Design an enzyme around this catalytic site. Structure first.
Site, mmCIF file in Angstrom:
data_model
loop_
_atom_site.group_PDB
_atom_site.id
_atom_site.type_symbol
_atom_site.label_atom_id
_atom_site.label_comp_id
_atom_site.label_asym_id
_atom_site.label_seq_id
_atom_site.Cartn_x
_atom_site.Cartn_y
_atom_site.Cartn_z
ATOM 1 N N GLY B 24 0.806 -1.210 0.000
ATOM 2 C CA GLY B 24 0.000 0.000 0.000
ATOM 3 C C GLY B 24 0.840 1.260 0.000
ATOM 4 N N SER B 28 -0.761 4.439 4.454
ATOM 5 C CA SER B 28 -1.987 3.650 4.331
ATOM 6 C C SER B 28 -2.233 2.729 5.525
ATOM 7 C CB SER B 28 -2.014 2.843 3.015
ATOM 8 O OG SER B 28 -0.960 1.893 2.958
ATOM 9 N N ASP B 54 11.427 -0.234 5.368
ATOM 10 C CA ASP B 54 12.446 0.684 5.843
ATOM 11 C C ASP B 54 13.565 -0.066 6.573
ATOM 12 O OD1 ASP B 54 9.963 2.913 5.668
ATOM 13 O OD2 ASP B 54 11.960 3.776 5.336
ATOM 14 N N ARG B 57 15.861 -2.184 4.545
ATOM 15 C CA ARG B 57 16.646 -1.285 3.703
ATOM 16 C C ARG B 57 17.860 -0.683 4.411
ATOM 17 N NH1 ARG B 57 15.466 0.912 -1.099
ATOM 18 N NH2 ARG B 57 13.575 0.298 -2.244
ATOM 19 N N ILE B 97 6.024 -0.889 0.665
ATOM 20 C CA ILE B 97 5.145 -0.224 -0.287
ATOM 21 C C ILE B 97 4.883 -1.178 -1.451
ATOM 22 C CG2 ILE B 97 4.961 1.679 -1.945
ATOM 23 C CD1 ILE B 97 6.434 3.452 0.051
ATOM 24 N N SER B 98 5.932 -1.795 -1.972
ATOM 25 C CA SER B 98 5.867 -2.815 -3.007
ATOM 26 C C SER B 98 4.923 -2.426 -4.134
ATOM 27 C CB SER B 98 5.557 -4.198 -2.424
ATOM 28 O OG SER B 98 4.487 -4.168 -1.555
ATOM 29 N N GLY B 147 10.324 11.291 -7.450
ATOM 30 C CA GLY B 147 9.815 9.953 -7.700
ATOM 31 C C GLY B 147 9.207 9.279 -6.481
HETATM 32 N N1 ADX Z 1 11.055 7.861 -3.522
HETATM 33 C C1 ADX Z 1 10.504 7.174 -2.400
HETATM 34 N N2 ADX Z 1 9.288 6.575 -2.483
HETATM 35 C C2 ADX Z 1 8.785 5.908 -1.428
HETATM 36 N N3 ADX Z 1 9.481 5.806 -0.270
HETATM 37 C C3 ADX Z 1 10.694 6.390 -0.132
HETATM 38 C C4 ADX Z 1 11.245 7.096 -1.207
HETATM 39 N N4 ADX Z 1 12.449 7.574 -0.813
HETATM 40 C C5 ADX Z 1 12.663 7.189 0.456
HETATM 41 N N5 ADX Z 1 11.591 6.480 0.875
HETATM 42 C C6 ADX Z 1 11.495 5.781 2.125
HETATM 43 O O1 ADX Z 1 11.508 4.397 1.941
HETATM 44 C C7 ADX Z 1 10.356 3.828 2.558
HETATM 45 C C8 ADX Z 1 9.786 2.849 1.654
HETATM 46 O O2 ADX Z 1 10.589 1.730 1.363
HETATM 47 P P1 ADX Z 1 9.993 0.415 0.724
HETATM 48 O O3 ADX Z 1 8.755 -0.001 1.498
HETATM 49 O O4 ADX Z 1 11.035 -0.656 0.683
HETATM 50 O O5 ADX Z 1 9.623 0.808 -0.771
HETATM 51 S S1 ADX Z 1 9.523 -0.116 -1.954
HETATM 52 O O6 ADX Z 1 8.781 0.615 -3.008
HETATM 53 O O7 ADX Z 1 10.839 -0.439 -2.438
HETATM 54 O O8 ADX Z 1 8.808 -1.362 -1.610
HETATM 55 C C9 ADX Z 1 9.429 4.970 2.822
HETATM 56 O O9 ADX Z 1 8.794 4.818 4.058
HETATM 57 C C10 ADX Z 1 10.289 6.092 2.918
HETATM 58 O O10 ADX Z 1 10.724 6.196 4.242
#
Ligand code: ADX
Ligand code: ADX
Lengths: 192, 192
Positions: B24, B28, B54, B57, B97-98, B147
């Site tokens: 999401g 969300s 996060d 990462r 977010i995926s 982005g």
């Molecule tokens: N351009 C970006 N879009 C979304 N999240 C970002 C972005 N840059 C930094 N973030 C951070 O990275 C987190 C999201 O990481 P993920 O859930 O791992 O995203 S995902 O798209 O690759 O699945 C967000 O909570 C935010 O803190």
């Protein structure tokens, strides 16, 4: 941060999460040691999980080769995954050739002191090659595999591992697992 | 292959390993849902582990950016790690977010049918932006983040997820977790 903590997971499992990092040449008995230890811990009601170099290399690390930089990444990722398993409260057994000291040391650095138990399968090349259970040394000699660890690629033994196994000979996978379980038990990792 | 099987680990934990994939937009409610579900399952004596976008990462995926190809790799690695957790018998909650369907679908493909439960936080951008708990949307508007998913990078909702949450509003993290736990219970994932 969620309210459920590592100590909560450990309380539920009645054990402490940790990384048992098994390193050594091909044929040094890593996998038979890992399996014996897993079986033994299971029978005691403790939850283990084995991260095996070959297996992980067909999934998470399917993108990696055996170039030195790719072995470093292989080890680094396995180290991070093992840390997650430990955080989940699992006794995580990583079993990879993991030939470079700096890379194993980096995995150690990811964990709190005591939570990373480096286990060296201290078996000389000549014994490993005589076993050659998977025919890898045969393949390396016949030239099929270039840069094979121990033949034409380096293995760097641990300078200060917690446990060193297999040097004597006529010591079985089960006896070696018993030594590891004894160590874990004494260090307190087998109860919350 | 060792003698200790997935069903043995499940027997020990009295539950079935699985992947609860929570997807999401930012804001969300993924993380509050994950925490509520974890707490609720813990209280029932079930072992969960949260893989949060996060957090992962800053460790395993510390090398990845937010370029589309890096998000794909982020998702792919998390999918493989979640599969390992499931194989260990753990109820693994992945909360990222995926944003791309093809990448979530690839994670699904890694698991046997039934073992991957896709959970969509069905909350519109406007509600997510009004919450903006971490100030990310504020930062994206002020131009600090290029982005950003939902603003100037795509989010592709699941076309056939097992569970869709949060659309109604005035539904709490705990009520939503109860719905997930009810689903898991009915599917048989909460007993060996
Ligand atoms: N351009 C970006 N879009 C979304 N999240 C970002 C972005 N840059 C930094 N973030 C951070 O990275 C987190 C999201 O990481 P993920 O859930 O791992 O995203 S995902 O798209 O690759 O699945 C967000 O909570 C935010 O803190
Ligand atoms: N050049 C090679 N050296 C060692 N193992 C290799 C090589 N090429 C293929 N393999 C296979 O990969 C397995 C070892 O993988 P890893 O344990 O993951 O190695 S490691 O050095 O990167 O830690 C071996 O059992 C063998 O099956």
């Amino acid at each position: 941060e969620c309210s459920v903590e590592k100590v909560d997971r450990q309380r539920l499992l009645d054990q402490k999460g940790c990384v048992i990092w098994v390193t050594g040449l091909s044929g040094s008995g890593k996998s038979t040691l890992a399996c014996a230890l897993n079986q033994m811990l299971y029978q005691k009601g403790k939850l283990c999980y084995i991260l095996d170099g070959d297996n992980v290399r067909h999934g998470l690390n399917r993108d990696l080769s055996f170039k030195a930089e790719d072995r470093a990444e292989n080890i680094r990722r396995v180290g991070e995954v093992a840390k997650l398993f430990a955080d989940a409260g699992i006794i995580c057994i990583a079993s990879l050739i993991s030939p470079y000291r700096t890379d194993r040391d980096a995995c150690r650095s990811l964990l709190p002191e005591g939570d990373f138990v480096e286990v060296f399968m201290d078996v000389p090349l000549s014994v490993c090659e005589a076993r050659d259970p998977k025919g890898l040394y045969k393949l390396a000699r016949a030239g099929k595999i270039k840069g094979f660890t121990g033949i034409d690629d380096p293995y760097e033994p641990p300078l200060n591992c917690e446990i060193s196994l297999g040097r004597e000979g006529g010591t079985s996978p089960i006896e070696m697992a018993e030594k590891v379980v004894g160590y874990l038990d004494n260090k307190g990792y087998l109860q919350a």
